[PDB]
């Protein structure tokens, strides 16, 4: 059971940013949604909730300015944010209560992975994937591209796990962001590449 | 909205450490719940209703506490423990409910000298303007290291960013990625290419280099 999450990646200030959480596999009867946003380098911070009775919370800061609500055939929740500045930038968290309290906090048994939201007029720009060649290391850097996620770097499909070590993106002089992924191995090797918000989707061999 | 302290901890691998959790309002029906954030993840619920482990939370966590005042008690602090913890509360059932502000927490381990690999910029890549050479500090501590790039022993600066991951979850140590980024011009006016790492595990300054072509 999971809450994949779904959102544009970035968008830019005045648009209605919107999100989507689908309950993928079925799981508790009576759940609760709600959603928590992280502002970079900042604690959670409550946007709503909507209970197993469809009972919708806001936080104080959201009453006017967002709408949550359900598509029960497609087991998906909703969450708008309109009027969107630079000060909505995070990273927003959809979480499941399972005593079903549309405003509780105490209790969040299961998380989605996050979508992010950068709020810029900057434009969105693809990467260029370059690689990088008893034990050795190699990687792939997912170089010059922006907004910063969605971003996924898996390597072999997921099989090679152990002494994977992907980096946090920094900001280069470019204005562009550039990250990267390294593998220490014993002396096929394939990095999965996904910008969503370019729809870049590359698999480097290295 | 919820106090928590301290604001970041630091002790060393089996140490008890504390987290306290303080409110203004007291928690309605012992709705207060611990959450442990590992780097690039999701929080994960770790304790609920003051004192509840999560099925699969190791026994080393606990929560104890009423009205007010609670706290997270870690018994054995781990490599794996490095997150920032938060707690949450419910104060009625009307929508009063918040985070805390967080506690960071930092494993102290002995010191360990970083291995460093060195990447020349790939031919895909470089048949854009840019050339990229990767330098890497691979499984150290302490976090404290200093990269200097040099091109044919001359000094760069200005040119190069850099990224550390977060503590280890099994060794508890660190690693470091510089990207140095020249124009393909320069690239191709030069051949050595080396990083230089500074590391207190390291007796003398190790240099990975390598010579283009």
């Known amino acids: 059971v999971q809450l994949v999450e779904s959102g544009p990646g970035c968008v830019k200030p005045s648009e209605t940013l919107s999100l989507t959480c689908t309950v993928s596999?079925?799981?508790?009867?009576?759940?609760?949604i709600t959603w928590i946003r992280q502002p970079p380098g900042k604690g959670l911070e409550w946007i709503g909730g909507?209970?197993?009775?469809?009972?919708?919370f806001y936080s104080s800061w959201a009453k006017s300015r967002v709408t949550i609500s359900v598509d029960t055939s497609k087991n998906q929740f909703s969450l708008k944010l309109s009027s969107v500045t630079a000060a909505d930038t995070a990273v927003y968290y959809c979480?499941?209560?399972?005593?079903?309290?549309?405003?509780?906090?105490?209790?969040?048994?299961?998380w989605g992975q996050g979508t992010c939201v950068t709020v810029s007029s900057f434009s969105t720009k693809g990467p260029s994937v370059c690689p990088l060649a008893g034990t050795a290391c190699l990687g792939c850097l997912v170089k010059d591209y922006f907004c910063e996620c969605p971003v996924t770097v898996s390597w072999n499909s997921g099989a090679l796990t152990s002494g994977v070590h992907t980096f946090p993106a920094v900001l280069q002089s470019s204005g562009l962001y550039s990250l990267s992924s390294v593998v220490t191995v014993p002396s096929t090797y394939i990095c999965n590449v996904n910008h969503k918000p370019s729809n870049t989707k590359v698999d480097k061999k290295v | 909205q919820m106090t928590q302290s301290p604001s970041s901890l630091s002790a060393s691998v089996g140490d008890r450490v504390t987290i306290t959790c303080q409110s203004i309002?007291?928690?309605?029906?012992?709705?207060l719940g611990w959450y442990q954030q590992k780097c690039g993840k999701a929080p994960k619920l770790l304790i609920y209703?003051?004192?509840i482990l999560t099925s699969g939370v190791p026994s080393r966590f606990s929560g104890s506490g009423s009205g007010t005042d609670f706290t997270l008690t870690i018994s054995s602090l781990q490599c794996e423990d490095f997150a920032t913890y938060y707690c949450?509360?419910?104060?009625?059932?009307?929508?009063?409910?918040?985070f805390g502000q967080g506690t960071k927490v930092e494993i102290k381990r002995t010191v360990a000298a970083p291995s460093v690999c060195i990447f020349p910029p790939s031919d895909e890549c470089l048949k854009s303007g840019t050339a990229s050479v990767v330098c890497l500090l691979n499984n150290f501590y302490p976090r404290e290291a200093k990269v200097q790039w040099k091109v044919d022993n001359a000094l760069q600066s200005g040119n190069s960013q850099e990224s550390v991951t977060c503590q280890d979850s099994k060794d508890c140590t660190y690693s470091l990625s510089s990207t140095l980024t020249l124009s393909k011009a320069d690239y191709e006016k030069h051949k050595v290419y080396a990083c230089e790492v500074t590391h207190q595990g390291l007796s003398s300054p190790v240099t990975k280099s390598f010579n283009r072509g």
């Open positions: 979480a499941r209560d399972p005593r079903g309290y549309g405003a509780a906090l105490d209790r969040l048994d299961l």
């Open positions: 596999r079925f799981s508790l009867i009576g759940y609760a």
């Open positions: 909507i209970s197993s009775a469809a009972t919708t």
């Open positions: 309002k007291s928690v309605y029906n012992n709705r």
């Open positions: 209703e003051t004192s």
């Open positions: 949450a509360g419910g104060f009625d059932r009307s929508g009063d409910t918040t």
